[PDB]
């Protein structure tokens, strides 16, 4: 059982760090009372989504590896995916919202106030949440306890699964469409916006309207640093979300058969750690980017 202890000896550590970070960002928004504005609204919604993901999705995964039986039961098996998929949707989509908000601020610094901005921003967050609920609903309709026949141990175990065995196309369609909508389109949008942000931040660097280039050396460096950090934000999100969207898809294509092997075991654990890591790289990276936000973070701690 040493390998199993390693699983929460790691899962719990990562969950703890992520909870600490996201909770501190939630604290900052409410406590200052002046930190409330259009940019801070989107970051707060992403932190809320990441809190839901870490609090709900991970312990169930730890239970899956720890115990063969499903502790939640039928009603619980219909409740859990509805929270997991909604949290995934909110997080992945608020990230795209942040990427477009930043692009608008940095690349076009004209009419940023845009009349009733705070109201529009409060509405875009809720609309994203509502869409996330809509996408999760079909995964709460078809989720039920189904029998699985291992070909190695030759044992028919009943476990909470997203779809019934009776259907052979519904699994494949749901897996492929979920992948295309939850990973490819958000990544495509974030990629475009952050590429444009970095391009402009570098073009602005050398175009500084100052006669003496020496007096502004520091500033130029900082701009050249911001571009690299934004490109790193596009890469992390891709990396973490690729193996989870690969292991799930693979298991959903070979649905009837159950694959118990060392390769699959280790790959599944690694994909779930990488996917959960995104929730903690979201706030902690902005922590590094700003010294004033660092001062606020340490105050809240």
């Amino acid at each position: 059982p040493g390998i199993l202890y390693v699983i929460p000896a790691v899962y719990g550590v990562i969950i703890l760090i992520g909870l600490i970070g996201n909770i501190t960002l939630i604290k900052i928004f409410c406590t200052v009372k002046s930190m409330r504005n259009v940019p801070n609204l989107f970051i707060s919604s992403l932190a809320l989504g990441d809190l839901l993901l870490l609090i709900t999705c991970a312990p169930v995964d730890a239970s899956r590896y720890l115990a063969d039986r499903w502790l939640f039961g039928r009603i619980g098996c219909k409740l859990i995916p509805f929270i997991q998929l909604t949290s995934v949707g909110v997080s992945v989509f608020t990230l795209t919202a942040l990427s477009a908000d930043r692009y608008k601020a940095i690349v076009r610094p004209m009419d940023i106030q845009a009349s009733h901005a705070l109201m529009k921003a409060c509405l875009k967050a809720a609309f994203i949440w509502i869409i996330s609920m809509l996408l999760a609903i079909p995964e709460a309709v078809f989720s039920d306890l189904h029998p699985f026949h291992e070909e190695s141990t030759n044992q028919t175990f009943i476990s909470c699964a997203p779809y019934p065995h009776s259907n052979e196309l519904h699994p494949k369609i749901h897996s492929m469409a979920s992948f295309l909508v939850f990973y490819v389109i958000p990544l495509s949008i974030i990629s475009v916006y952050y590429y444009f942000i970095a391009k402009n931040l570098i073009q602005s660097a050398y175009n500084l309207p100052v006669e003496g280039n020496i007096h502004v050396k520091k500033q130029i460096e900082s701009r050249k640093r911001l571009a690299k950090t934004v490109l790193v934000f596009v890469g992390l999100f891709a990396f973490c979300w690729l193996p989870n969207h690969v292991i799930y898809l693979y298991r959903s294509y070979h649905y009837s058969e159950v694959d118990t092997s060392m390769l699959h075991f280790v790959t599944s654990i690694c994909a779930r750690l990488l996917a959960f890591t995104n929730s903690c790289v979201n706030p902690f990276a902005l922590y590094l980017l700003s010294k004033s936000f660092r001062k606020q973070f340490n105050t809240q701690l």
């Binding site: 115990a67 995916p81 998929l85 995934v88 699964a161 997203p162 939850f182 694959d259």
Partner: peptide
């Protein structure tokens, strides 16, 4: 014996 085959996550 649960971790094998599950939802999106």
């Amino acid at each position: 014996x649960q971790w094998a085959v599950x939802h999106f996550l």
